[PDB]
Amino acid sequence: KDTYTDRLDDWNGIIAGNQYYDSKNDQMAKLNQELEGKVADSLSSISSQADRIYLWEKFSNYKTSANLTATYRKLEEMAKQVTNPSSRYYQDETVVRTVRDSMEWMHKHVYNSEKSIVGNWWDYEIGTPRAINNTLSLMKEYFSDEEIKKYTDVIEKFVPDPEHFRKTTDNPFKALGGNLVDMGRVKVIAGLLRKDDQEISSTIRSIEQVFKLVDQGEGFYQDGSYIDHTNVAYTGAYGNVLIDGLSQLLPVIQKTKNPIDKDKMQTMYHWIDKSFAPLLVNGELMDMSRGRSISRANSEGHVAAVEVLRGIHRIADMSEGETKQRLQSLVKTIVQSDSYYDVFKNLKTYKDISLMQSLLSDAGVASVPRTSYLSAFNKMDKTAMYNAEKGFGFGLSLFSSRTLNYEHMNKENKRGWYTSDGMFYLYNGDLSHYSDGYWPTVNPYKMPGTTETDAKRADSDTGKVLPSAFVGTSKLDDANATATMDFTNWNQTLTAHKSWFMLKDKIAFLGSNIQNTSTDTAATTIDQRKLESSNPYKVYVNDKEASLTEQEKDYPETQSVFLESSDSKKNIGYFFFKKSSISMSKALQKGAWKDINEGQSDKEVENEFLTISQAHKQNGDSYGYMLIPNVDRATFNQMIKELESSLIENNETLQSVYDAKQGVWGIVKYDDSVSTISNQFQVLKRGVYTIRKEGDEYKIAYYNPETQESAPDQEVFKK
Template structure:
């Protein structure tokens, strides 16, 4: 596949799978305009059809050895005895089957059988060091991915990592299949038709190469292990990953273009002194075949696509390191320049993938993915940038400012109490080993690396913020999450540096307009609030690769409350929460199909390109979704909502006034379902700090039964220590349904790839309001981290007034600060009060100063 203005000659070995006597060659055109010429097309016989049998790696005695001073040579036949010719010991020495150069010069190696019979004199030449610039960068990459030079033998975290890697290598060596005629290397990775097995196989060899480089490992410079790694790489190259292979069947392009080549270049980097340039060229030629263009994925398949975001960075971790290993200056320049698009902000409203100036990050076409693919981007880039800065092609000051913008505007607002908000993590929420706390550490790891390339003052400020966030993590857990001595050393240095003072997060309200999310942190009350919406530009949820099979309503106005229960979302929340009753959502009550790969295949058969939509993954028909802020304590959000199958609609709005968040719903109606409800909350009850339930100021005993009350004006969840209280004030007496129930589930229910089938159980308190009449409404105020005394006072003072709540207008008036928020759903004159008349649909936020209404913010949205 070739794109752009280029010439390309491609040669391919075609091996028919069946008995054929005719071949038809078809030329395919991708979308686009221009001229294309196919020239010099020929078919020629290449010999007998290969049998398809597994090829074995063979070794023969070297004819001569040419060795740069920076390399070592692993002797081809370990059973032979090699001796340096007399008088030449100052040029090379032989140690345990390895030739180590000492100085430039020529000599002979005398080769004997075990019985002492001389069979050859091998000419050996030691040349000067190879390209010192490239070699230095390769060494730096080795330090980045492992960091053996940073190893501190007295550091418990480093000791633990070394033991973990040693134990893993030992286990994999013991289970290795050494029969070259077999079709795999490990029994549990035997199906190379699943390309993930190929990637995992290469990664095990990479892990072995790490321990060869670790001075305290029992495998350090182990010649036998080095020989094994080289042989197995050669065997995989012969049989599975080479230029004559194709991405076929159920194989995933990702494994061929990112997963496997990353493991290959890292292994070659770790064992660089032991590979000849010819061996490196052979391995990387396969990478060049599957990944010929550093700006494009699926180049060897139909429907190639532009490399962007986290995947583009992963591409860089393949192509840049490949260029270093092959000492290819042109390829290095091309691969580094391919990253330039990362530093270009997407235009507001463009529906582009990548970062926006408002802090949004979009990936997979239209999914909010800061905490997943954004993490991949910043983690990978943070490894590459120190390398680039040491090269002639380092980033300029403008690009470093862009990186700082990502950190400050995209990541820090989503990091609350040591967690990375789940609303930004897409299908990653269904991964047991990727909790919100672990995702935070992943982001912080990349941010810490990047801080070291920023100007000193900026570096110190960002590291101060990092230190404050890390305080929410246990040090042992934090360091055990790191997979290199380099990173452990960076974290240890930060924690020990008394000159870097923790900088606690200040009150901050971030409106991520381009991904339809809102994040709020209230410093005085120390709580975080997140709001997850979707629109005609963003997807409600993504299920893919059998992950996040029950994420149905996570983008339908779900809210997250981060109080002092630090394990609320990170401790088995997602397999046990009732996915039909997500907090803040208005939904039809009824079961849904798990969005598995098998379900999607069935729908694809029936509905073709509409399969995802039929499964419930959809954008809204309406663009009337957005949020505005007046300051860091005042905001308004709205969503002209329709559910996934367009049978339920509601006008949903939220107002933030300091430590209070108002929820409004109007025009709630369904054309299909009888039972519709709004989930006021579904809160996990921490057994170590359980909640008592107070309704209208009176304690209500709630065990496993369902309780319905028709006169509710206030609800208080009163935690045992009083620090996690949550209050709810209702605009008028409301009928609510309460339950406290044990809920059970498995990680494998929401992620079919999980091997954990254990049933886990958590207790949840669920509060919901049923909607049994057309155009129903709801209106309530959330008060997080409120004391019982404060809540009792708030019950009587009614400082926030719901002026209007219907399908045309939703108006709130905060009497305390005289803020007015207005959601106007239609164009045309709308009277707000005696002084305000609005003509255009949109969101408006006013503050009355004296007798004047001052417009603080507005967003004109298209009306119905």
């Protein structure tokens, strides 16, 4: 036909990839079989109505916008198979007619220009328009240009401006990040289908906004942080959509009359290296960056990581030289380190499957274990740490006056209340820990690392920002960093100076100035670990075996707790600097995804959890322990003797831990007094410090979380 048809061909090759199908290809045949099964269920349940109320009973209530998108996506699946020579529905007359009559019908009494948004705007402006564009693009050889325009006009009505969304509403918003990229998958493709040049260029010009790094608001930051929805850490969900979608569009956009400059897109590599890579551990995308996505059963950590990975791979594929090789190496190593999730379970197009296969089999592409790293995403109040030598990841989830604690929207993530109240994540040998139903079964009132009262919480509640701006991480190098959070709980009835000292192969948790003005009880959850019935843990308290029950047992005068597995890479030890009074329990916890996300299944799910907590019955209480993972029993026992005097101070104004072996100090100061440390030096400014001594020279890393600035050494360090 023309260049528009040419671009749409490229698009079809990216969103479906039928030209790349090979029946002898196992992974490919598996996706084909899934699509076959999907079309057969749709065609068999579609109402052979005499013009009935709906096309599919399951998606009948057209008041629930979700049903418009689900319906058109079923037609897209049909379009994918009708153009697949290997599908039993290839060129099938009844499927071609079902798709054509279904479009005329939906366009008749459900989705048209004379309609208004009912329910979610996203379905009307992104979900449905994408499914329609894809359906028409794939089956453009069965539709007339006039029919195509006819079926896309409704998209032009709901989405006429490539710069704003919710345009037909009373309060539209500027499109950026993930939503802006979907604006390209909506208007660039519809523009191609309609052969509308102004639409194409105006939309590509708008998408280019996505390449600019920001220092405020939504978007990617220089330090690797990604914020969306005003002030929510969102690299792992909206960022996913951003890279996933942009990578599909680029090859098509780059072949139109409005290609995008090569230096404008150079920031893509910054996202990959600074924003995405640090959040990927053993093939898992850290949940602290996925917002409300965590409450979706079909998008657990390893699954969400493939959206990013397939996006990175595409980018690598259209790159060249060492950039291509290096990105290739990045994707290869991450995928191969994932022994838990089969990457192919989330590569939904033949070209994506093909790319992955050749990548994994090309001996020319290096696949070397990733090195140690520590990212202080201070612009989104999150910190990611990875130790390659011992093999564990650590995630610190916080929030402040600059960021929302959790997102509960569209009935999703109803109980994420405390997922940012100083919650921590440990990524060890059990790659499935935060998967297999962790979210719907974890007790939402006892999120690991958090200090909270036992007051009941409502599902209808929504996120809040923190009163204090004193939240931040001072990074010294790839293995050492210190963080603090001037914590106040949701109803301002409890406070705590929570601090963390990341010291290469361990993390110290310090909390002081714990006050409670309410009548509820306060306690800090040391941990709530999801167990594997296959790899049971042998629990020790003070080095003596302990038998945990469903009922809470008290362990006063506890100096240590050790969780021993047959696999040392799953071991977790906790060393209490000062004998502490803790309680522990191991109980089967049940729940359903629908409990935390209305749109999910109410099918019962269950998992065994080991919970460790320390109550705080008096004002001015505190806690202090070192988390030491991946070492065996004897090594842990030897290490706690070494750390005997690692606690320097832990009060209302000063918290510090010293790593004698490393010669590294972690310090948090809440005021400007002169603090003398280990009779060696003095720190003089309120803020966060990570200091290392090398001979008589001192390496200083200082960060004032409030002003988001460091300071000349002579201002904060002395002697």
